[PDB]
């Protein structure tokens, strides 16, 4: 059973350097053509580099030439990738793949950014709203944090049904998440609604009560 | 060389579907070693075909690779429900590899469903910070393909708009949300704000007037 697992990804400042690893299992590296491929936030796949087996050529994407170097460590059954004059463009999930991309690793994220910051939570209330389905949608804007993840909850588990948490979004070196809840017009404003957010990294805990506009 | 694929396709379970891969530079041939990989939820990739015909070990008989027209093709004979995934193709141009943009394939496992859209105005607290984030939530739509367009006073707001990519829901439907950022000054200058979501031809527009 073949197994690939990459490691090394971390936050990095533009211009910084990184070196990623891919450890192989189930085969011997030496006689296997291996590649590096990256999946961007845009959810697009891009070829990074390939290293042929035997002791053959190594090829690089134009977007990567000169800045990135691939290395084999046949002794440890490890494949390496060195990343050096890092750019916003380089932020992606990096994966190694076997010959003709049959086996893939789980990926390692590299984020090229500015620095750690606790999130600014904003409550989202409908603008002097109506009730179509006698159902009202409230939300919470979790803004400008770094690094990921974030934990959003509503009335701390009480509200589970009608919850939609959206994936993060990175724009000027900081993430942006959004979360929502749909409740009958019976519960809000009569009863209160709170979005509970927690930024692990920063050990930030915030609670925002959603009150009328 | 650019590699082009169909944006999305939709089939019903049991049907045969064909996904294609076109080469900008010319006819796809045998020496471009057409490769096909599948991407499943939580960015899980697996190679399906290699060398324009060869099925990776373990991949079901249903999938076939071939050359038809001046293109490389992946045919899924009697498409199954668990085949709703993203399909990427890759072509070798004797030096490098070029991946196509991927094909979002949909296997209807439930009726088509329209998006539940909702636009939120910028909070007080936020405008204080000289920021104005308009949030547009898009929910329980199926298939998982949407187009969002923003309009400020009838004019399409060409920038400051970021849109999340569709993500499944427990009812195997999808969600997305779009954002429209402006400065609190920008916001003042305008009075009509609109988030229009198009899904399978039908456009739902949730608007708001500020003044
Ligand atoms: O797998 C890849 O990434 C490249 N593959 C294409 C493919 O197998 O789909 C192609 C590769 C053959 C191969 C090897 C090298 C070149 N380019 C050269 S020699 N350039 C000269 C520069 O001066 C082209 C094709 N493989 C063919 C095969 O698998 O039978 C052998 C190998 O991988 O070593
Ligand atoms: In090869």
mmCIF file of N, CA, C and O in Angstrom, chain B residues 1 21 29 37 40 129 148 183 193 211:
data_model
loop_
_atom_site.group_PDB
_atom_site.id
_atom_site.type_symbol
_atom_site.label_atom_id
_atom_site.label_comp_id
_atom_site.label_asym_id
_atom_site.label_seq_id
_atom_site.Cartn_x
_atom_site.Cartn_y
_atom_site.Cartn_z
ATOM 1 N N UNK B 1 1.230 26.814 -24.161
ATOM 2 C CA UNK B 1 0.057 25.926 -24.263
ATOM 3 C C UNK B 1 -0.910 26.088 -23.098
ATOM 4 O O UNK B 1 -0.490 26.113 -21.944
ATOM 5 N N UNK B 21 -10.785 17.507 -23.057
ATOM 6 C CA UNK B 21 -9.555 18.244 -22.855
ATOM 7 C C UNK B 21 -8.990 18.747 -24.125
ATOM 8 O O UNK B 21 -8.473 17.964 -24.941
ATOM 9 N N UNK B 29 -2.461 14.391 -28.973
ATOM 10 C CA UNK B 29 -1.969 13.122 -29.556
ATOM 11 C C UNK B 29 -1.525 12.278 -28.369
ATOM 12 O O UNK B 29 -1.555 12.653 -27.184
ATOM 13 N N UNK B 37 -7.178 13.147 -13.652
ATOM 14 C CA UNK B 37 -7.237 12.866 -12.200
ATOM 15 C C UNK B 37 -8.586 13.402 -11.689
ATOM 16 O O UNK B 37 -9.108 14.410 -12.209
ATOM 17 N N UNK B 40 -12.031 14.800 -5.086
ATOM 18 C CA UNK B 40 -13.107 14.518 -4.141
ATOM 19 C C UNK B 40 -13.082 15.515 -2.986
ATOM 20 O O UNK B 40 -12.109 16.281 -2.732
ATOM 21 N N UNK B 129 -15.006 51.943 11.803
ATOM 22 C CA UNK B 129 -13.692 51.481 11.420
ATOM 23 C C UNK B 129 -13.338 51.919 10.004
ATOM 24 O O UNK B 129 -12.247 51.572 9.545
ATOM 25 N N UNK B 148 -22.214 34.988 -9.230
ATOM 26 C CA UNK B 148 -22.622 36.166 -8.444
ATOM 27 C C UNK B 148 -22.095 37.428 -9.164
ATOM 28 O O UNK B 148 -20.947 37.547 -9.607
ATOM 29 N N UNK B 183 -15.236 51.461 1.361
ATOM 30 C CA UNK B 183 -14.821 52.302 2.500
ATOM 31 C C UNK B 183 -16.149 52.920 2.973
ATOM 32 O O UNK B 183 -17.137 52.933 2.171
ATOM 33 N N UNK B 193 -27.943 48.991 -3.626
ATOM 34 C CA UNK B 193 -26.901 47.936 -3.601
ATOM 35 C C UNK B 193 -27.508 46.617 -3.945
ATOM 36 O O UNK B 193 -28.530 46.263 -3.345
ATOM 37 N N UNK B 211 -30.466 54.899 0.817
ATOM 38 C CA UNK B 211 -31.173 56.189 0.850
ATOM 39 C C UNK B 211 -31.971 56.412 -0.439
ATOM 40 O O UNK B 211 -32.755 55.476 -0.771
#
